[PDB]
């Protein structure tokens, strides 16, 4: 065994001491890591012990209980809960966490990789905590990230500093630092979008896809890749580069993905890694929320690529 | 639980019915040991290249476990130029063609990857040679894949059906979770790498158009393409749909190798009630002339593969 | 590592040499599945009685895995009054006497406990009965124990020797770590429950005195007594020494049952070069008349057991 | 899975918030738990990957690195290091940990259970930290305990509050609370001592052993049990009751076991569980240390039993 392992907790702490900051954040993310290991083990034995609905409810309960017990949060927004959860006085701390407990729970049946997505805001107001504290623009995130439960469990953490990847060591139950200051490729070679929705795409998306399939400058076309699980397609976009798109369509006129705990965590991870995240109009990280479960279009990925689609959005405006 | 049905118990009970020798049980028992080790390697593949090196170790491990089973005589690998002829001391009756880690490139993006295998019976009486591997997929005795994803799954197809076994990590034992899987007749998803749109033959090109913009105004299809044959085929099995990797002209014979990628997947599909075609003939009836031969493959739910076959008729 | 010697590979290669049927490999493969499950149960036995309930589940699990191996016909358990006769559908040639979780009381103090087993071959032609289990330990075909301690260890004794296999938890596979273990001729430790000092027969009483206060002024012995036969016997095997559980008058026949505690441990010892005696005869040559019969046992390094035998002579 | 797991970290924190105390202790014990899981996995695969010496050196390095990185310690005493380790200024915190990294490393070859023992002192002086801070009497321990690597890994933690047992869940890598406020049986029925040393025992020990083997009041004798691994025999004494004795003998005139990190951690655990720990003369927890690797006789266990031996020590004085 290595006698000098850089666990997530140690990393956060060495960076925290460096800024003589918070402390509470380490109790927060450590509790989150317990929930994440418990959900990873549960997914890994999923069919031996439904998935779509039930396992996600159990994940929701576990992430809420551990976050309340970290003594680091005051307001919690979940995909599952209609209203925001306010923590008991004696257990309160300074943070607002917005989380999706199990993105894609349906996908378990098909053994498609899925994940946990989270956003961490610092409660800025001096008032009694309320869902109002959750409605900050994405640019206000203190920390955000995701856990991908795939062939290995990866926890990706973006903080002010940049993006750091951690992998769960199954043997000792610790997320270990494996990639240190991640920056996405300036342009990529893959585009990820559900083309079953082609009949309802806006002219800008449509022009871009055919420009990737039939490249104007008589170059090689882009490869398509679409796992159908946001955490899987954004993690591939981050490591390999390219662009991931979930624009608006018929049944999803304002996009499908929820702004506070899917779009904004991924957008903060993506911009801290040097990439871009836009609606096609504004940058996702500037949208002041209205409803905790508000939806947004998201286009994220390699800077050169997102820019090409923004230029095409300018043309048809 | 007290009475657990493991892959060994299942294959042994089945094997008894054949009044056989025990060699197939020896073989799949060995294979499971390799599958568990590759699973642990990929589960911590990152705590430290992992494409060339991990597919090499995966390949050496599978050949070693198969040779020691006393069940094999010819072994064909994605990784090896020629067939491996098992030493006389260790020889048995089965031929195994396998891809040890399909899509090993994908490990960096944590994409589910897996091991694919097809098992034949050597029927002839002369020395083992790669010609014993050159049989049509119609003659596979057993075939399957192990998926290294959020859970490790072994899907096994034999004459009596398709069954799914999940690796219980606590006891390191594959437990039977799904018995005689049948695919649904029609599905909602089409998988293909549409980035090759310029190169598609017009029959493919028409069908894709038809799935996005339905003529009978029916609901359009969802598109899913993990980029890993085991993950795309496994979803097609569980959820129904159609998976396609036809000739993309750059690959005029298709990309996927016949003996260890197309034929195992095709045997699984047919045993589950799906179809597998090149668009011109059923892949299980192609007679191989080279152990590393490629084929185009279109497989999945019957109605959807039939629909594409009709569009192929109408393109003359 | 690419070529790993598992318990299955080892037993299969050995079995080939006997020109046998595969049943012993079937049997020990099944047994390993039970041993891995009991190991995981004890490793989290506490995260929640665990004596009566855990020894019951351990017993049901072992009987289930043995019946499905198609290798057994009579099964004798510490937990069951009568022998279990395997159904005709599932019968094979071996008789198995086993203690499923020896010292299950000890789990609360996290004392290492384990499974002990002795395997006979039914030689007669009439219906299986518990009389096929009533053979001398000299006739065991194989015997051993699995120790659930800081690591799970399977010590296996057969005609060719004693070998030790460690459970690798990552791949759930018993790996050969020690080959043909031999015990050292003389050791430094004596194990006995000295709390019974009033009840010891004067030969035991003299030897203990002699080990604490050496007449030839030699260094005294260390005393170790875990209170668990598998842990005490395993240390005696690895480190040398003498382990004793003679008649403590309250138990005038000794405590430990002959067929599934004394005889497996004694076969292991003799195969490793040690001795096992009641103080009056070798336990492996005792002819059993009841499947739940007890014996006194003194086993360990040859010189030390011989020394105690001489003191037994001198007590007339 | 349980959606409300009481991990060691959560427990310590709910008790810590209750006293609005330290914080640093949670970073300390959390780091210690990482080291303990890594040593548990290493012991569990010990013969597949010598034991006596080497694995204990690697354990020593790992416990030192994680304690330095918890930003909670200033002085560390180890069995392995001749002098005490002083932490770097930027990494210092208020605690002194005295630890035995792998008690009984020899015993691995025989698969005898072994453990990690630790004592946690708060640096009381205002001076620059030095080994002088480690030399406090045992009564000054803030927290002490042990990890037993046996058929299961158990972490036992005694703090001001009492004794709490935690068990490592192999599946998620978390010590889970399994026994909550442990108190030892007033009298027991087992005595644990290496009787190979009989030739050199003092008359008090000698009289007591024969009184356990031949009970004066014509009762049933005591059972003997001696694993030869302090952590195993003290853990059995704690759960089952009885008395564990390592008095002085010929090669060990002041006892064998080291005072700061074997005797005092076990003595604090034992007295917080209602038992006693004595030299035969003074209580172990009152001995002011002199040398960091000073030795002590220890007799610990059920109150009624230790008292009987102390009465016998009075008689021959
Ligand atoms: O991205 P395209 O060119 O469609 O290829 C992906 C296919 O290639 C694969 O063979 C994976 O490639 P490798 O197995 O050669 O690593 C198959 O598993 C995928 O479906
Ligand atoms: O404490 P004493 O009476 O010597 O008995 C301990 C012996 O009993 C045991 O049979 C354990 O008891 P159980 O197996 O009946 O639980 C054997 O494993 C021990 O060596
Ligand atoms: O089939 P579609 O609409 O492309 O869905 C893909 C998107 O839907 C999601 O699976 C949402 O999942 P759920 O709706 O079950 O929460 C995302 O993870 C993913 O990006
Ligand atoms: O054989 P003995 O002297 O009774 O030794 C037992 C004592 O020695 C120890 O094993 C000490 O171990 P080490 O000397 O290897 O550090 C204690 O754990 C135990 O209580």
mmCIF file with all atom_site columns, C-alpha atoms in Angstrom, chain B residues 192-298:
data_model
loop_
_atom_site.group_PDB
_atom_site.id
_atom_site.type_symbol
_atom_site.label_atom_id
_atom_site.label_alt_id
_atom_site.label_comp_id
_atom_site.label_asym_id
_atom_site.label_entity_id
_atom_site.label_seq_id
_atom_site.pdbx_PDB_ins_code
_atom_site.Cartn_x
_atom_site.Cartn_y
_atom_site.Cartn_z
_atom_site.occupancy
_atom_site.B_iso_or_equiv
_atom_site.pdbx_formal_charge
_atom_site.auth_seq_id
_atom_site.auth_comp_id
_atom_site.auth_asym_id
_atom_site.auth_atom_id
_atom_site.pdbx_PDB_model_num
ATOM 1   C CA . UNK B 1 192 ? -25.690 4.189   -34.794 1.00 0.00 ? 192 UNK B CA 1
ATOM 2   C CA . UNK B 1 193 ? -22.734 6.580   -35.032 1.00 0.00 ? 193 UNK B CA 1
ATOM 3   C CA . UNK B 1 194 ? -24.426 9.266   -37.113 1.00 0.00 ? 194 UNK B CA 1
ATOM 4   C CA . UNK B 1 195 ? -21.123 11.143  -37.421 1.00 0.00 ? 195 UNK B CA 1
ATOM 5   C CA . UNK B 1 196 ? -20.601 8.860   -40.443 1.00 0.00 ? 196 UNK B CA 1
ATOM 6   C CA . UNK B 1 197 ? -23.721 10.227  -42.187 1.00 0.00 ? 197 UNK B CA 1
ATOM 7   C CA . UNK B 1 198 ? -21.865 10.992  -45.464 1.00 0.00 ? 198 UNK B CA 1
ATOM 8   C CA . UNK B 1 199 ? -20.740 7.424   -45.868 1.00 0.00 ? 199 UNK B CA 1
ATOM 9   C CA . UNK B 1 200 ? -23.971 5.536   -45.183 1.00 0.00 ? 200 UNK B CA 1
ATOM 10  C CA . UNK B 1 201 ? -25.434 3.405   -47.937 1.00 0.00 ? 201 UNK B CA 1
ATOM 11  C CA . UNK B 1 202 ? -28.887 4.900   -48.933 1.00 0.00 ? 202 UNK B CA 1
ATOM 12  C CA . UNK B 1 203 ? -30.884 2.104   -47.209 1.00 0.00 ? 203 UNK B CA 1
ATOM 13  C CA . UNK B 1 204 ? -29.423 3.014   -43.838 1.00 0.00 ? 204 UNK B CA 1
ATOM 14  C CA . UNK B 1 205 ? -29.816 6.708   -44.696 1.00 0.00 ? 205 UNK B CA 1
ATOM 15  C CA . UNK B 1 206 ? -33.525 6.287   -45.454 1.00 0.00 ? 206 UNK B CA 1
ATOM 16  C CA . UNK B 1 207 ? -34.294 4.222   -42.280 1.00 0.00 ? 207 UNK B CA 1
ATOM 17  C CA . UNK B 1 208 ? -32.577 6.801   -40.003 1.00 0.00 ? 208 UNK B CA 1
ATOM 18  C CA . UNK B 1 209 ? -34.664 9.588   -41.686 1.00 0.00 ? 209 UNK B CA 1
ATOM 19  C CA . UNK B 1 210 ? -37.763 7.482   -41.145 1.00 0.00 ? 210 UNK B CA 1
ATOM 20  C CA . UNK B 1 211 ? -37.015 7.037   -37.405 1.00 0.00 ? 211 UNK B CA 1
ATOM 21  C CA . UNK B 1 212 ? -36.588 10.766  -36.823 1.00 0.00 ? 212 UNK B CA 1
ATOM 22  C CA . UNK B 1 213 ? -39.474 11.855  -39.023 1.00 0.00 ? 213 UNK B CA 1
ATOM 23  C CA . UNK B 1 214 ? -42.103 9.029   -38.900 1.00 0.00 ? 214 UNK B CA 1
ATOM 24  C CA . UNK B 1 215 ? -44.298 8.737   -42.118 1.00 0.00 ? 215 UNK B CA 1
ATOM 25  C CA . UNK B 1 216 ? -47.198 7.051   -40.276 1.00 0.00 ? 216 UNK B CA 1
ATOM 26  C CA . UNK B 1 217 ? -46.944 9.984   -37.730 1.00 0.00 ? 217 UNK B CA 1
ATOM 27  C CA . UNK B 1 218 ? -45.973 7.556   -34.996 1.00 0.00 ? 218 UNK B CA 1
ATOM 28  C CA . UNK B 1 219 ? -43.724 8.726   -32.113 1.00 0.00 ? 219 UNK B CA 1
ATOM 29  C CA . UNK B 1 220 ? -40.045 9.154   -33.236 1.00 0.00 ? 220 UNK B CA 1
ATOM 30  C CA . UNK B 1 221 ? -37.275 7.016   -31.891 1.00 0.00 ? 221 UNK B CA 1
ATOM 31  C CA . UNK B 1 222 ? -34.826 7.940   -29.206 1.00 0.00 ? 222 UNK B CA 1
ATOM 32  C CA . UNK B 1 223 ? -31.176 7.827   -30.174 1.00 0.00 ? 223 UNK B CA 1
ATOM 33  C CA . UNK B 1 224 ? -28.557 6.205   -27.879 1.00 0.00 ? 224 UNK B CA 1
ATOM 34  C CA . UNK B 1 225 ? -24.955 5.347   -28.863 1.00 0.00 ? 225 UNK B CA 1
ATOM 35  C CA . UNK B 1 226 ? -22.536 4.639   -26.025 1.00 0.00 ? 226 UNK B CA 1
ATOM 36  C CA . UNK B 1 227 ? -19.676 3.837   -28.482 1.00 0.00 ? 227 UNK B CA 1
ATOM 37  C CA . UNK B 1 228 ? -19.034 0.441   -26.903 1.00 0.00 ? 228 UNK B CA 1
ATOM 38  C CA . UNK B 1 229 ? -20.526 -2.633  -28.527 1.00 0.00 ? 229 UNK B CA 1
ATOM 39  C CA . UNK B 1 230 ? -21.242 -4.470  -25.260 1.00 0.00 ? 230 UNK B CA 1
ATOM 40  C CA . UNK B 1 231 ? -23.065 -1.476  -23.698 1.00 0.00 ? 231 UNK B CA 1
ATOM 41  C CA . UNK B 1 232 ? -25.084 -0.764  -26.866 1.00 0.00 ? 232 UNK B CA 1
ATOM 42  C CA . UNK B 1 233 ? -25.913 -4.437  -27.447 1.00 0.00 ? 233 UNK B CA 1
ATOM 43  C CA . UNK B 1 234 ? -26.751 -4.984  -23.729 1.00 0.00 ? 234 UNK B CA 1
ATOM 44  C CA . UNK B 1 235 ? -29.233 -2.030  -23.771 1.00 0.00 ? 235 UNK B CA 1
ATOM 45  C CA . UNK B 1 236 ? -30.711 -3.321  -27.053 1.00 0.00 ? 236 UNK B CA 1
ATOM 46  C CA . UNK B 1 237 ? -31.246 -6.693  -25.323 1.00 0.00 ? 237 UNK B CA 1
ATOM 47  C CA . UNK B 1 238 ? -32.819 -5.320  -22.135 1.00 0.00 ? 238 UNK B CA 1
ATOM 48  C CA . UNK B 1 239 ? -34.819 -2.414  -23.600 1.00 0.00 ? 239 UNK B CA 1
ATOM 49  C CA . UNK B 1 240 ? -35.412 -3.436  -27.247 1.00 0.00 ? 240 UNK B CA 1
ATOM 50  C CA . UNK B 1 241 ? -34.353 -1.312  -30.164 1.00 0.00 ? 241 UNK B CA 1
ATOM 51  C CA . UNK B 1 242 ? -31.904 -1.669  -33.057 1.00 0.00 ? 242 UNK B CA 1
ATOM 52  C CA . UNK B 1 243 ? -28.101 -1.332  -32.967 1.00 0.00 ? 243 UNK B CA 1
ATOM 53  C CA . UNK B 1 244 ? -26.305 -0.748  -36.285 1.00 0.00 ? 244 UNK B CA 1
ATOM 54  C CA . UNK B 1 245 ? -22.688 -0.787  -37.444 1.00 0.00 ? 245 UNK B CA 1
ATOM 55  C CA . UNK B 1 246 ? -22.942 -1.288  -41.204 1.00 0.00 ? 246 UNK B CA 1
ATOM 56  C CA . UNK B 1 247 ? -20.244 -0.494  -43.738 1.00 0.00 ? 247 UNK B CA 1
ATOM 57  C CA . UNK B 1 248 ? -19.246 3.143   -43.252 1.00 0.00 ? 248 UNK B CA 1
ATOM 58  C CA . UNK B 1 249 ? -17.220 3.045   -46.515 1.00 0.00 ? 249 UNK B CA 1
ATOM 59  C CA . UNK B 1 250 ? -13.931 3.890   -44.611 1.00 0.00 ? 250 UNK B CA 1
ATOM 60  C CA . UNK B 1 251 ? -14.804 0.469   -43.266 1.00 0.00 ? 251 UNK B CA 1
ATOM 61  C CA . UNK B 1 252 ? -16.398 -1.117  -46.422 1.00 0.00 ? 252 UNK B CA 1
ATOM 62  C CA . UNK B 1 253 ? -16.630 -4.472  -44.614 1.00 0.00 ? 253 UNK B CA 1
ATOM 63  C CA . UNK B 1 254 ? -17.752 -2.891  -41.363 1.00 0.00 ? 254 UNK B CA 1
ATOM 64  C CA . UNK B 1 255 ? -15.477 -2.411  -38.355 1.00 0.00 ? 255 UNK B CA 1
ATOM 65  C CA . UNK B 1 256 ? -16.449 -5.202  -36.086 1.00 0.00 ? 256 UNK B CA 1
ATOM 66  C CA . UNK B 1 257 ? -14.727 -8.513  -36.368 1.00 0.00 ? 257 UNK B CA 1
ATOM 67  C CA . UNK B 1 258 ? -16.912 -11.456 -37.136 1.00 0.00 ? 258 UNK B CA 1
ATOM 68  C CA . UNK B 1 259 ? -15.682 -14.329 -34.993 1.00 0.00 ? 259 UNK B CA 1
ATOM 69  C CA . UNK B 1 260 ? -15.333 -12.571 -31.689 1.00 0.00 ? 260 UNK B CA 1
ATOM 70  C CA . UNK B 1 261 ? -17.537 -9.469  -31.874 1.00 0.00 ? 261 UNK B CA 1
ATOM 71  C CA . UNK B 1 262 ? -20.379 -9.995  -34.377 1.00 0.00 ? 262 UNK B CA 1
ATOM 72  C CA . UNK B 1 263 ? -21.053 -13.763 -34.025 1.00 0.00 ? 263 UNK B CA 1
ATOM 73  C CA . UNK B 1 264 ? -21.309 -13.955 -30.117 1.00 0.00 ? 264 UNK B CA 1
ATOM 74  C CA . UNK B 1 265 ? -23.608 -10.919 -30.047 1.00 0.00 ? 265 UNK B CA 1
ATOM 75  C CA . UNK B 1 266 ? -25.658 -12.393 -32.914 1.00 0.00 ? 266 UNK B CA 1
ATOM 76  C CA . UNK B 1 267 ? -26.004 -15.814 -31.209 1.00 0.00 ? 267 UNK B CA 1
ATOM 77  C CA . UNK B 1 268 ? -27.177 -14.011 -28.020 1.00 0.00 ? 268 UNK B CA 1
ATOM 78  C CA . UNK B 1 269 ? -29.759 -11.983 -30.008 1.00 0.00 ? 269 UNK B CA 1
ATOM 79  C CA . UNK B 1 270 ? -31.146 -14.957 -31.929 1.00 0.00 ? 270 UNK B CA 1
ATOM 80  C CA . UNK B 1 271 ? -31.417 -16.959 -28.729 1.00 0.00 ? 271 UNK B CA 1
ATOM 81  C CA . UNK B 1 272 ? -33.354 -14.082 -27.211 1.00 0.00 ? 272 UNK B CA 1
ATOM 82  C CA . UNK B 1 273 ? -35.679 -13.695 -30.261 1.00 0.00 ? 273 UNK B CA 1
ATOM 83  C CA . UNK B 1 274 ? -33.934 -10.843 -32.076 1.00 0.00 ? 274 UNK B CA 1
ATOM 84  C CA . UNK B 1 275 ? -32.287 -10.890 -35.481 1.00 0.00 ? 275 UNK B CA 1
ATOM 85  C CA . UNK B 1 276 ? -28.782 -10.094 -36.637 1.00 0.00 ? 276 UNK B CA 1
ATOM 86  C CA . UNK B 1 277 ? -28.003 -9.275  -40.296 1.00 0.00 ? 277 UNK B CA 1
ATOM 87  C CA . UNK B 1 278 ? -25.366 -7.653  -42.452 1.00 0.00 ? 278 UNK B CA 1
ATOM 88  C CA . UNK B 1 279 ? -28.236 -6.133  -44.385 1.00 0.00 ? 279 UNK B CA 1
ATOM 89  C CA . UNK B 1 280 ? -27.654 -8.830  -47.018 1.00 0.00 ? 280 UNK B CA 1
ATOM 90  C CA . UNK B 1 281 ? -27.516 -12.132 -45.038 1.00 0.00 ? 281 UNK B CA 1
ATOM 91  C CA . UNK B 1 282 ? -27.788 -13.363 -41.450 1.00 0.00 ? 282 UNK B CA 1
ATOM 92  C CA . UNK B 1 283 ? -24.334 -12.979 -39.802 1.00 0.00 ? 283 UNK B CA 1
ATOM 93  C CA . UNK B 1 284 ? -24.573 -16.390 -38.093 1.00 0.00 ? 284 UNK B CA 1
ATOM 94  C CA . UNK B 1 285 ? -24.590 -18.105 -41.496 1.00 0.00 ? 285 UNK B CA 1
ATOM 95  C CA . UNK B 1 286 ? -21.503 -16.340 -42.898 1.00 0.00 ? 286 UNK B CA 1
ATOM 96  C CA . UNK B 1 287 ? -18.718 -18.868 -43.445 1.00 0.00 ? 287 UNK B CA 1
ATOM 97  C CA . UNK B 1 288 ? -15.451 -17.236 -42.249 1.00 0.00 ? 288 UNK B CA 1
ATOM 98  C CA . UNK B 1 289 ? -12.286 -17.459 -44.359 1.00 0.00 ? 289 UNK B CA 1
ATOM 99  C CA . UNK B 1 290 ? -10.007 -15.491 -42.022 1.00 0.00 ? 290 UNK B CA 1
ATOM 100 C CA . UNK B 1 291 ? -10.100 -15.511 -38.182 1.00 0.00 ? 291 UNK B CA 1
ATOM 101 C CA . UNK B 1 292 ? -9.830  -11.694 -38.171 1.00 0.00 ? 292 UNK B CA 1
ATOM 102 C CA . UNK B 1 293 ? -12.511 -11.112 -40.841 1.00 0.00 ? 293 UNK B CA 1
ATOM 103 C CA . UNK B 1 294 ? -14.947 -8.140  -40.373 1.00 0.00 ? 294 UNK B CA 1
ATOM 104 C CA . UNK B 1 295 ? -18.667 -7.993  -41.145 1.00 0.00 ? 295 UNK B CA 1
ATOM 105 C CA . UNK B 1 296 ? -21.345 -5.266  -41.022 1.00 0.00 ? 296 UNK B CA 1
ATOM 106 C CA . UNK B 1 297 ? -23.909 -5.987  -38.281 1.00 0.00 ? 297 UNK B CA 1
ATOM 107 C CA . UNK B 1 298 ? -27.507 -4.681  -37.666 1.00 0.00 ? 298 UNK B CA 1
#
